[PDB]
């Protein structure tokens, strides 16, 4: 349609110039003429965009239209001689209404310059094969007759090969299987079979601990969750018990030899469990139940230490505030647990190994929470409250958090 700028704004423009008592008709004459010129330039810019096929448009397209109009394209400056700057586009000014209009040159130096992209390259992909579009990442996607499975037999064989690679016998095969699951749209609809395979492996792993195998199963779970085509939420109900059992499972193998794997297994389980809660979040659907299970294990007296460590790892992962609120009432209980494992002349018992894992996770999580609540102070008083459970190391961890804040 036809739109004109306000007459009062034209009068203000004359007032800045110092012109006064301008005719009302003259104000109307200025607005109708200016509006036509703006519309004419917009149509001219559209012609450049249509030939360009950019659609989004590129900076200086209006400047090209101004050059076509034989009018200077410079914005925010003009040269009377016109020799230093000609019809070459100024490029415009990067200024916004939000901008304060006052800046410090030193602050701009402090800001890092961005990295530069590689030159344009040409890649060939098959849009269609024999008139059928392939499902690839580059592309957008009275006896009755015997019933046949919906999945293709070749696809079922492909699923079998991926599961064999996922077992983790060869690291390269497991990595390739994870990449294939992430990049394959066709893998969708094989998710119920994949979820059942993980659950069957996990239940056997509960009977005899297989921490290395459990970590490989978690890698397969991560690959399935990342792929967009499959519906993770529909089969999430099978996945959640399997991840929970792995985090709280007792270690059949000697604790010191497999301790590094056990910490990694708990870390993998806590991350996937929080991601499952994030997926399809609803009030009291996943997060409330998982938090309740972790809290019930921790509160229970004489809880297995491996179970306690898994519950503590899960609670810390769900929220930073959740660990901070829970630790303060149980801080005396946590100190008592460390004293109970310390008592006795035998280090063979797993209770000491479980306690050291729980305390180490608590100390690292506590240092940021203490810094967030207030600047670190009275470190000796804090050690007295802990009854020297970590002694100097707890004070050192708080100092390390302060040093990290100073570095940032």
């Amino acid at each position: 349609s036809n739109t004109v700028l306000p007459s009062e704004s034209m009068k203000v423009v004359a007032e800045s110039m110092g012109i006064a008592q301008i005719q009302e008709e003259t104000c109307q004459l200025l607005t109708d003429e200016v509006s036509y010129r703006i519309k004419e330039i917009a149509q001219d810019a559209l012609k450049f965009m249509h030939m360009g096929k950019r659609q989004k448009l590129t900076t200086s397209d209006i400047d090209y239209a101004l050059k076509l109009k034989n009018v200077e394209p410079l914005y925010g400056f003009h040269a009377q001689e016109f020799i230093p700057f000609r019809f070459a586009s100024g490029g415009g000014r990067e200024l916004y209404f939000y901008e304060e209009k006052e800046v410090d040159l030193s602050d701009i130096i402090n800001t890092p310059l961005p990295r530069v992209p590689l030159d344009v390259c040409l890649k060939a992909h098959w849009l269609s094969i024999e008139g059928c579009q392939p499902a690839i990442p580059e592309n957008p996607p009275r006896l009755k007759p015997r019933s046949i499975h919906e999945l293709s037999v070749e696809q079922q064989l492909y699923y079998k090969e991926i599961t064999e690679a996922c077992v983790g016998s060869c690291e390269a095969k497991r990595a390739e299987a994870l990449q294939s699951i992430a990049t394959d749209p066709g893998l969708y609809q094989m998710l119920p079979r994949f979820s059942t395979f993980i659950s069957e492996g996990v239940r056997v792993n509960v009977v005899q601990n297989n921490l290395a195998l459990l970590i490989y199963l978690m890698r397969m779970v991560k690959a399935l969750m990342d792929n967009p085509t499959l519906y993770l939420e529909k089969y999430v109900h099978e996945l959640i018990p399997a991840v929970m059992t792995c985090i709280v499972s007792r270690q059949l193998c000697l604790r010191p030899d497999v301790d590094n794997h056990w910490a990694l297994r708990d870390f993998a389980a806590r991350l996937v469990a929080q991601i499952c809660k994030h997926f399809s979040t609803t009030t009291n659907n996943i997060q409330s139940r998982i938090t309740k299970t972790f809290t019930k294990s921790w509160v229970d007296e004489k809880t297995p230490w491996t179970t306690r460590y898994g519950s503590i790892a899960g609670l810390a992962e769900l929220g930073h505030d959740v660990i901070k609120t829970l630790i303060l009432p149980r801080l005396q209980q946590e100190g008592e647990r460390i004293r109970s494992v310390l008592d006795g002349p035998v280090l063979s018992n797993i209770d000491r190994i479980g306690a050291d894992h729980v305390q180490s996770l608590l100390l690292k999580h506590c240092a940021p929470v203490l810094a967030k609540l207030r600047p670190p102070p009275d470190n000796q008083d804090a050690y007295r409250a802990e009854f020297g459970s970590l002694g100097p190391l707890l004070c050192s961890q708080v100092v390390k958090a302060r040093a990290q804040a100073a570095l940032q």
């Binding site: 925010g76 400056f77 040269a79 009377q80 230093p84 000014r93 530069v116």
Partner: protein, 90 residues
Amino acid sequence: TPLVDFLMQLEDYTPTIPDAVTGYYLNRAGFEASDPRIIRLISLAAQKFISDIANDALQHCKMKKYTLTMEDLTPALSEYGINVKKPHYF
């Protein structure tokens, strides 16, 4: 020819503007980076033009310190014959 001798001595003394940044603008202009010393000479000329505007503005700043404003730029630009426009839109 002093400028030719200066270009020969321009192999060292990398300019304040990075050669790659100057070269990218020259590539947009359609000028290929045939000689690195040539890029340095163009970069030095660009720095000199900005420095001269700043030096003229500094003399005005003393009259009206060590702060650069659009109002300070306008008298220095008037000597150049180039007129700045205040945005008046933000």
